[PDB]
Design a protein around this ligand. Structure first.
Ligand SMILES: [Zn+2]
Ligand SMILES: [Zn+2]
Ligand SMILES: [Zn+2]
Lengths: 115, 99, 63, 109, 81, 237, 111, 118, 355, 105
RNA sequence: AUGAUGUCAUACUUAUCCUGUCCCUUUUUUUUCC
C-alpha cells in the first residue's frame, strides 16, 4: 500500500507452489446448488482433520459463495489448515465435482445424481 | 587503554621534551593526563625496560625473592630488573605451570 | 545445466563480429549479454556515450 | 506468600566436578524432598546441576538458605529456573488415554 | 539474496505504480512494447501529430484514432516465446 | 548549541550585521571558523557564508571563497563547496552570472580529492542546474555532466544519492535527450551491477518527462517475428 | 500527454453532480460538485477507480434521475495478449461495456 | 468496563490526588460530607451480614446494613449498602478497603450520594 | 552462562554450536556502550541470513520473556527483531507464532511507544509471512480459554487486517463471528471488527456494509456480553465513518432503539454510545425524533454513579445537544441545571480523560 | 525529509485540505527539506486528514500551526504531484531518544 | 599495485539528535438497591 521494500508473497507462491490439475476451467456459481455439496465438504474436511472445525468449514463456504472463485487462492488459503498436499488433493477433488454439478441441468453433482 | 598511535606520539614527545615535563606532553595528547603519560612511560614504553623471556637465572631469582618478601612486588622488582607487573604475571605463570 | 544451455546460446566473438554491421564496437564480454544483438546495435547508435572504463577494474576509481 | 519467580526448580553452578551423587542428595535434602536431580555431562555443562524439588516451600527456603554456601573451596552459586520453553511435544495419544482413564473411572461423562 | 530481492521489491513497486519502468531483467520485447504504447497515447493526445497522420494517409481523425487504439493491444508482435 | 532554533537565528543575524557593516570583515571571521573540527559548527558557518553572499551581492564574497579553496585542508575545501551548494540554491535564477566563474572549481573537485569532495560538488551541480534552468547556460552543465557521470558506480549511500540528485537536476536543465544518450549503452550490458545502476537512472528519467521521450528513442530494427520500427514517424507529408 | 495520467476523456453527469476524468489506461478520478450557501461552485476531493491493464476507448455519463450517478466506459484488457506466445488472445479479446456507479451516501465508486 | 476497572480507577483517584498534593479539605471525598453510606460491590455470594459487619466494623460502629438479595431465590446479588456511624469512617473505609481480595473476589467500595431506602 | 566456560572452537565440532556462541553477542547488544551496540547491531543485521532464523529466535525470545528485563533493553531487543525480520523475509514462516506470543503484549501496554513499535513489527510480520500463514497460525487462539490471549490476538488481527487489506481477510471474519458452537469466538470476532474500525479508521467506508452485516446478528443475541460488544463495535464504526454510511447502518437503528427502552445497566451505556454516534450521521427528519426521544433517557442518567455511564453521557450530550436541530431555550431550561449540579465536581478534574 | 531513509509517505491520492506544520518543523520543505523560496501549498490525503489527524504537523505530528509549502525546486521537478506526503511511521530516532531519556531522568 | 577477514581506534558524512509527549492499553465472576 505504502511500502516498496516488501514483496507480494501471494504472487511469489503463485509462481512457486505445486498446484492441482482441474484448476483451469473457470467456474460460475449461479449454475450451482451448494446445500447439496455442503455435507460433502463437511465430512471431507472433518475426516481430513479427525475432528470438526466449523471455522474451516465456513471459510471454504465463504470463499466459494463468490460469483467466480479463484481455485489458486483457495488452495493457498487451505494450505495452512490442511497439510498442503491434502489441500491439493481436496481442491482438485471438489473443483471437478463443481464442473460436474454445473454442467448438470439441476446444478447438482453426478455423484449425488447416482446416490 | 593505550593504542599504538598514542604510544608513538608519546615516544616522540618524551624524546623531544624530556622526562620531567609531563604536563606539556599531557597537553599534546587528548584524553590523557600527565599522571597517565608518566605511568605509561615508566611501565612499558621506556627503552630501558626489557621485554625478553626469562633466563632461568632470572626465574630462580623470582622464586627465591617472592618467597622471602611475599606480596612485595615493587620491592622485589628492581632486584631482578623488570617491572612489578611483569614479575607478578610471570610468577603466577610459573606457579600454575607447576600446579 | 540450463545455465549451460544459455551458454550454448552464447555466440563466439567471431560469430558476433560477423553478424553485426559494425564489428569494432564488439568487445570481449559482449557475448555474455542476454541480448547481444541489441547491445551491439545500441553501442553503434550515434551520439550515445560508452560506459565508464572502470566497471571491471578491481581497484575503485580515484582511490 | 511467595513471589512468583520462586520455583520448585533451581539452577546451581560452582559445584565440585564429579561430585558424589549421594552427597548431592543429602546436601540438598538438608531442606526436604528432592523430586529429581540432573548434572550436566558435556564439558560445557560439567559442574552445574538442575534440581527439581517436590515442594514449593522446600525449594524456596533452600534458595533462601543455601545460596551462599561454601563447600569444596567455592561458594555454591544458585538461581531460580525460568522454565519458559518446552523442548518436545506433549504426546496427545497417551495424554488423551490417561484422561480417558480419568473419565471412565470417575464417571463424569 | 538480501539486496537482490529487496531491490526487486522496490522495482516491482515502482513498475506496478508506473507502467513502463524497467529493471536489470527487462527484455527487448517489453522495452519496445511500452515504448510503442506510449508513442500511441501521445499521438492521440497531441492534436497535431493526429493531423499529420490523418493527412499522410487519407483517413479521418476519428478513424485514425480508432486504428491507433486498436493497435495498442499488441503493437510489436506476440510475446517472446 | 544543541537546539536548532538558536543556530538558525544565529545564522540570520550574521546576515543582518553583514548588512549593517560591509561584508568583508564578517566574511573573514567566517572562513576562519571553517578551520574548526566539529561538523555542526562548520555546517552552520557554511550556511552563514551563503546568507552573507545572498544579502550583499555574491560578487563581493565569491573571490574570497574561491581563494579559500586553495588552502590545503580537507575541512575548508569541503566548507567552500558546501557553501556554494547553499549559495546557488538561495540566489536561484541569478546563478547565470557566476556559473562560468564557478565551473572550473567544480571540475577540479570532481576529479577526486576525497569521496566527500565529489559528493559535495555533485550537490552544487544539482542546485546550480535547477537554478539556471531556462537561460541557455547548457554547455557548462553538459561539461560538468562529463565529470559527474563516472561517479555512477559508487556504493556509499551519501555519494550515490548526491550523484542521483545531480543527475535529475541536470535532467530538467539539459533535458532528457542528453540523459538518454548517456543511459543507452548500459541498459543491456553484460554485467549486472551496471545494469542495476543504469536502469535506476533510466527509471528516474522516464518517470518525470516520460512524454518528452517519445521523440527521442532510437531506431531499433525488426527481427524475424516482431516488428519493432515505428513507421508513423516516417510518413512524409 | 502521459498514458496513465487522466486528462484524455472527460465525462460529466447529466444532472450535474459529478465529473469523471480518465486516462487511456489505468486511472479514473471522479470529482463531486456542489453549491455552498452562497451558491458558488465548490468541488470535493477525488474518488478513484484505478484498474490495471485496461485500455479505455470512451467514457460518458449515463442519464439517471437523482440516483447514484453512473458512467459508461468502453474498455478492453491487454493483460492476456501480453502473455500469449502465439497470438491467440491477440484476436478474440473483445471490449466490454461497463457501468461504474458513484455512491454518494457511502462516498466511493463501485464497478 | 468490568468492575475491576472501577476498582482500579478509584485507586487511581487516590494516588493521583496524592501526586498533586491536595489538602484534606479539597479531597474528592469532600463532596460527600453529608452521607455516611458506602456501597460495597463484588462481594461473594456466600458472605452474610455477620461477615460484612465483622469485616467492615474495623473503622467504626455500623449503624445500618442492607445486603441486596434477589427476591425470588433470596440469594445475595453480590452488593451491599452500609451506613457507618460517622462520615469520617466512610472516608477511612473507602480509602482502605477498596480493592481487597475476599475469597478471591476483589471487592470494591465507594460512597453513596443520595441513598434511597428500600 | 554458556559464555563463561571457555574452550577452543574446533573442539566444538558443531559449527551450529560455534555460530551459537558467536551469536550470543546478543549480550554485547543488550548491555554495552553505544559503540558496542552499533557494531554488534550491524554485525547481526548483516549475518542474519547465514545465521538463520532458528538459532536467532531461540536465543532472542527467552530474553524478551525474562522477568527482570527493564525498558531500554526491551526496546533494543525489539529493534533487533525488527531488523532481522526485515532481512529474513520468508524464513520466519515457522516462528510467526512465537514472535506473536512475545510481541502481542506490547499491544496492550502503557508506554505509547511500546504500542506503536509492537504495531509496526506485527505489520511487517504480516507482510513478510503472507496471509495464509497468519490466518492458520492465529486461528486456534480465537477459541482460547484465556481472555488475555483472546484480547491480544484480536488486536493483532486488526493489525494484520490493516497491513494486508480487509477484502482478503473478510471471509475469515464472517466465519469466526458466525461460528455457532462457541460464543467466545463470536465475541472475539466482533471485537476484531471493533479494533479494525479503531485502527484503519477512514478506510472502512468501501466495506462498511459488509462489516455492519457481519455484526448486526449480535445486537439481538441473548448472551448479554456479545450484545454489549456489538453495540460498542457499532459506535466505533459510526465514529470511523462520520458523515457517511447511514444507509448502511439503516438496518440497525431498530435493534438499538428498542434495546434502549427495555434495557437497564451496562447495555444501556453501550447502546447509548451507539445511538449517540449515529445521531450526527442522520438526516434531520430522523435526528429530531431520535434526539427528542433520547434526551429523555439522558436527563435520567445525569444522576448515574457508574463511571462509564457518566463518561458515555458526557460524550452523548456533546453530540445530541450540540446539533443544528435543537433550540437554545430547551437546553438552558432542562440540561444546564442538572448538568452543572452533577458533572462539575472534583473527582472529574482528578480524572485524566473525564477532565 | 531527505535526511532519514527509514521513513515512508502515505502516497495516496490528494485532496483539498491544506497541510500544517508544528513549531519545531515550521518553515522547511516536506521533501527537499530546504528553508527557502516556498512556492505551493501542501494538500493531504483525506484518510490521513480524518479525525484526530486534523491540524497536525505532516512531519512532526504535533499541533499544526502554519501551512506547509513546497520549495521551488520540488515545484520545478514536480515532486509535489505524488499525493499525501505524510510520514506514516515514527522512525527509530523518536522512540530511541525517548528511551535514552526515560532511563536517564 | 589497492585481497577478504577483522571486536583497531582515528578521520569523515547526514543545516541528522538533544525537545519533543503519553488521550484512545480500561481488557474478568452483567449488576448502585422504591
Ligand atoms: Zn513539527
Ligand atoms: Zn522541497
Ligand atoms: Zn494520506
Amino acid at each position: 500500500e505504502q511500502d516498496n521494500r516488501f514483496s507480494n508473497k501471494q504472487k511469489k507462491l503463485l509462481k512457486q507452489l505445486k498446484f492441482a490439475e482441474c484448476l483451469e476451467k473457470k467456474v460460475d456459481m449461479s449454475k450451482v446448488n451448494l446445500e447439496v455439496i455442503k455435507p460433502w465438504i463437511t465430512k471431507r474436511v472433518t475426516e481430513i482433520l479427525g475432528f470438526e472445525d466449523d471455522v474451516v468449514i465456513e471459510f471454504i463456504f465463504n470463499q466459494l459463495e463468490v460469483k467466480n472463485p479463484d481455485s489458486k487462492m483457495m488452495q493457498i488459503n487451505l494450505t495452512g489448515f490442511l497439510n498442503g498436499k491434502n489441500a491439493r488433493e481436496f481442491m482438485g477433488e471438489l473443483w471437478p465435482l463443481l464442473l460436474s454439478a454445473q454442467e448438470n441441468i439441476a446444478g447438482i453433482p453426478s455423484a449425488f445424481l447416482e446416490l | 587503554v593505550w593504542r599504538n598511535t598514542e604510544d608513538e606520539i608519546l615516544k616522540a614527545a618524551v624524546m623531544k621534551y624530556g622526562k620531567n615535563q609531563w604536563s606539556r606532553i599531557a597537553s599534546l595528547l587528548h584524553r590523557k593526563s600527565a599522571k597517565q603519560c608518566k605511568a605509561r612511560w615508566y611501565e612499558w614504553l621506556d627503552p630501558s625496560i626489557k621485554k625478553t623471556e626469562w633466563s632461568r637465572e632470572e626465574e630462580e631469582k623470582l622464586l627465591h625473592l617472592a618467597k622471602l618478601m611475599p606480596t612485595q612486588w615493587r620491592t622485589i622488582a628492581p632486584i631482578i630488573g623488570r617491572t612489578a607487573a611483569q614479575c607478578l604475571e610471570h610468577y603466577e605463570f610459573l606457579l600454575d605451570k607447576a600446579a | 545445466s540450463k545455465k549451460k544451455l544459455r551458454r550454448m546460446n552464447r555466440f563466439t566473438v567471431a560469430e558476433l563480429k560477423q553478424l553485426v554491421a559494425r564489428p569494432d564496437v564488439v568487445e570481449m564480454h559482449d557475448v555474455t549479454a542476454q541480448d547481444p544483438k541489441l547491445l551491439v546495435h545500441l553501442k553503434a547508435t550515434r551520439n550515445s556515450v560508452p560506459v565508464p572504463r572502470h566497471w571491471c577494474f578491481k581497484r575503485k576509481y580515484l582511490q | 506468600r511467595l513471589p512468583p519467580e520462586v520455583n520448585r526448580i533451581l539452577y546451581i553452578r560452582n559445584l565440585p566436578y564429579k561430585i558424589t551423587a549421594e552427597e548431592m542428595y543429602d546436601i540438598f535434602g538438608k531442606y526436604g524432598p528432592i523430586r529429581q536431580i540432573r548434572v550436566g555431562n558435556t564439558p560445557e555443562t560439567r559442574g552445574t546441576a538442575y534440581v527439581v524439588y517436590e515442594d514449593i516451600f522446600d525449594a524456596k527456603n533452600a534458595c533462601d538458605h543455601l545460596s551462599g554456601f561454601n563447600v569444596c573451596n567455592r561458594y555454591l552459586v544458585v538461581l531460580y529456573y525460568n522454565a519458559n520453553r518446552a523442548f518436545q511435544k506433549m504426546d496427545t495419544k497417551k495424554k488423551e488415554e490417561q484422561l480417558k482413564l480419568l473419565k471412565e473411572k470417575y464417571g463424569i461423562n | 539474496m538480501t539486496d537482490r530481492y529487496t531491490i526487486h521489491s522496490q522495482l516491482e513497486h515502482l513498475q506496478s505504480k508506473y507502467i513502463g519502468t524497467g529493471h536489470a531483467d527487462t527484455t527487448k520485447w517489453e522495452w519496445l512494447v511500452n515504448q510503442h504504447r506510449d508513442s500511441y497515447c501521445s499521438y492521440m493526445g497531441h492534436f497535431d501529430l493526429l493531423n499529420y497522420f490523418a493527412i499522410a494517409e487519407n483517413e479521418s481523425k476519428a478513424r485514425v484514432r480508432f486504428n491507433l487504439m486498436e493497435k495498442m493491444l499488441q503493437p510489436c508482435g506476440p510475446p517472446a516465446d | 548549541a544543541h537546539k536548532k532554533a538558536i543556530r538558525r537565528a544565529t545564522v540570520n543575524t550574521f546576515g543582518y550585521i553583514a548588512k549593517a557593516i560591509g561584508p568583508h570583515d564578517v566574511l573573514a571571521t567566517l572562513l576562519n571558523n571553517l578551520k574548526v573540527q566539529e561538523r555542526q559548527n562548520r555546517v552552520c558557518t557554511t550556511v552563514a557564508i551563503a546568507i552573507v553572499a545572498e544579502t550583499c551581492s555574491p560578487f563581493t564574497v565569491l573571490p574570497a571563497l574561491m581563494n579559500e579553496y586553495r588552502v590545503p585542508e580537507l575541512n575548508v575545501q569541503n566548507g567552500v563547496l558546501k557553501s556554494l551548494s547553499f549559495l546557488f540554491e538561495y540566489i536561484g535564477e541569478m546563478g547565470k552570472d557566476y556559473i562560468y566563474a564557478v565551473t572550473p572549481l567544480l571540475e577540479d573537485a570532481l576529479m577526486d580529492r576525497d569521496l566527500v569532495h565529489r559528493q559535495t560538488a555533485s550537490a552544487v551541480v544539482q542546485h546550480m542546474s535547477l537554478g539556471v534552468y531556462g537561460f541557455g547556460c547548457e554547455d557548462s552543465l553538459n561539461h560538468l555532466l562529463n565529470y559527474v557521470w563516472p561517479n555512477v558506480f559508487e556504493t556509499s549511500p551519501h555519494v550515490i544519492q548526491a550523484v542521483m540528485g545531480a543527475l535529475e537536476g541536470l535532467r530538467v536543465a539539459i533535458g532528457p535527450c542528453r540523459m538518454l544518450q548517456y543511459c543507452l549503452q548500459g541498459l543491456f550490458h553484460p554485467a549486472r551491477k551496471v545494469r542495476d545502476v543504469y536502469w535506476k537512472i533510466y527509471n528516474s528519467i522516464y518517470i518525470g518527462s516520460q512524454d518528452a521521450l517519445i521523440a527521442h528513442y532510437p531506431r531499433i530494427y525488426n527481427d524475424d517475428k516482431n516488428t519493432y520500427i515505428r513507421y508513423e514517424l516516417d510518413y512524409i507529408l | 500527454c502521459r498514458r496513465i495520467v487522466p486528462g484524455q476523456f472527460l465525462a460529466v453527469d447529466p444532472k450535474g453532480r459529478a465529473v469523471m476524468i480518465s486516462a487511456i489506461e489505468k486511472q479514473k478520478l471522479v470529482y463531486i460538485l456542489n453549491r455552498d450557501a452562497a451558491a458558488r461552485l465548490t468541488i470535493s476531493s477525488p474518488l478513484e477507480a484505478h484498474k490495471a491493464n485496461t485500455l479505455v476507448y470512451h467514457v460518458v455519463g449515463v442519464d439517471v434521475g437523482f440516483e447514484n450517478p453512473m458512467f459508461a466506459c468502453l474498455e478492453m484488457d491487454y493483460e492476456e495478449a501480453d502473455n500469449d506466445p502465439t497470438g491467440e488472445a491477440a484476436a478474440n479479446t473483445q471490449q466490454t461495456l461497463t457501468f461504474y456507479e458513484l455512491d454518494l451516501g457511502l462516498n466511493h465508486v463501485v464497478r | 468496563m468490568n468492575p475491576l476497572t472501577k476498582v482500579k480507577l478509584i485507586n487511581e483517584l487516590n494516588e493521583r490526588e496524592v501526586q498533586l498534593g491536595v489538602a484534606d479539605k479539597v479531597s474528592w471525598h469532600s463532596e460527600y460530607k453529608d452521607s455516611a453510606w458506602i456501597f460495597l460491590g463484588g462481594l461473594p455470594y456466600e458472605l452474610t451480614e455477620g461477615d460484612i459487619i465483622c469485616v467492615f466494623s474495623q473503622y467504626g460502629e455500623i449503624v445500618n446494613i442492607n445486603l441486596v438479595r434477589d427476591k425470588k431465590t433470596g440469594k445475595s446479588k453480590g452488593f451491599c449498602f452500609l451506613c457507618y456511624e460517622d462520615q469520617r469512617s466512610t472516608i477511612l473505609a473507602v480509602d482502605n478497603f477498596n480493592g481487597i481480595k475476599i475469597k478471591g473476589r476483589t471487592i470494591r467500595v465507594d460512597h453513596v450520594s443520595n441513598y434511597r431506602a428500600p | 552462562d554458556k559464555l563463561l566456560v571457555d574452550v577452543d572452537e574446533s573442539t566444538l565440532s558443531p559449527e551450529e554450536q560455534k555460530e551459537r556462541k558467536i551469536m550470543k553477542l546478543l549480550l554485547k547488544i543488550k548491555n554495552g556502550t553505544p559503540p558496542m551496540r552499533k557494531a554488534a547491531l550491524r554485525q547481526i543485521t548483516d549475518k542474519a541470513r547465514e545465521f538463520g532464523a532458528g538459532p536467532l529466535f531461540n536465543q532472542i525470545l527467552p530474553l524478551l520473556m525474562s522477568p527482570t528485563l527493564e525498558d531500554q533493553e526491551r526496546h533494543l531487543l525489539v529493534k533487533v527483531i525488527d531488523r532481522i525480520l526485515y532481512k529474513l523475509d520468508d524464513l520466519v514462516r515457522p516462528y510467526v507464532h512465537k514472535i506473536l506470543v512475545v510481541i502481542e503484549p506490547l499491544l496492550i501496554d502503557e508506554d505509547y511507544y511500546a504500542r506503536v513499535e509492537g504495531r509496526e513489527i506485527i505489520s511487517n510480520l504480516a507482510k513478510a509471512a503472507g496471509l495464509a500463514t497468519m490466518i492458520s497460525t492465529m486461528r486456534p487462539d480465537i477459541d482460547n480459554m484465556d481472555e488475555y490471549v483472546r484480547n491480544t490476538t484480536a488486536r493483532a488481527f486488526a493489525v494484520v487486517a490493516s497491513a494486508l487489506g480487509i477484502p482478503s481477510l473478510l471471509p475469515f471474519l464472517k466465519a469466526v463471528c458466525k461460528s455457532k458452537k462457541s460464543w467466545q469466538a463470536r465475541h472475539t470476532g466482533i471485537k476484531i471488527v471493533q479494533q479494525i474500525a479503531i485502527l484503519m479508521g477512514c478506510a472502512i467506508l468501501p466495506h462498511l456494509r459488509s462489516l455492519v452485516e457481519i455484526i448486526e446478528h449480535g445486537l439481538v443475541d441473548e448472551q448479554q456480553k456479545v450484545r454489549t460488544i456489538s453495540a460498542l463495535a457499532i459506535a466505533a464504526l459510526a465514529e470511523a465513518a462520520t458523515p457517511y454510511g447511514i444507509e448502511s447502518f439503516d438496518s440497525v437503528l431498530k435493534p438499538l432503539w428498542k434495546g434502549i427502552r427495555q434495557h437497564r445497566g451496562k447495555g444501556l451505556a453501550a447502546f447509548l454510545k451507539a445511538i449517540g454516534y449515529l445521531i450526527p450521521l442522520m438526516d434531520a427528519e430522523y435526528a429530531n425524533y431520535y434526539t427528542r426521544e433520547v434526551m429523555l433517557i439522558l436527563i435520567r442518567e445525569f444522576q448515574s454513579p457508574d463511571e462509564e455511564m457518566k463518561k458515555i453521557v458526557l460524550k452523548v450530550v456533546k453530540q445530541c445537544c450540540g446539533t443544528d436541530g435543537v433550540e437554545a431555550n430547551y437546553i438552558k431550561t432542562e440540561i444546564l441545571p442538572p448538568f452543572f449540579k452533577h458533572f462539575w465536581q472534583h473527582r472529574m478534574a482528578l480524572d485524566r480523560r473525564n477532565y | 525529509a531527505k535526511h532519514h531513509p527509514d521513513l515512508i509517505f502515505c502516497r495516496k491520492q490528494a485532496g483539498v485540505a491544506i497541510g500544517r506544520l508544528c513549531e519545531k518543523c515550521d518553515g522547511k520543505c516536506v521533501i527537499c527539506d530546504s528553508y527557502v523560496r516556498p512556492c505551493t501549498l501542501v494538500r493531504i490525503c483525506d484518510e490521513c486528514n480524518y479525525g484526530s489527524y486534523q491540524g497536525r504537523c505532516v512531519i512532526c505530528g504535533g499541533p499544526g500551526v502554519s501551512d506547509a509549502y513546497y520549495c521551488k525546486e520540488c515545484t520545478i521537478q514536480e515532486k509535489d504531484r505524488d499525493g499525501c506526503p505524510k510520514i506514516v511511521n515514527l522512525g527509530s530516532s523518536k522512540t530511541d531518544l525517548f528511551y535514552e531519556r526515560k532511563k536517564y531522568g
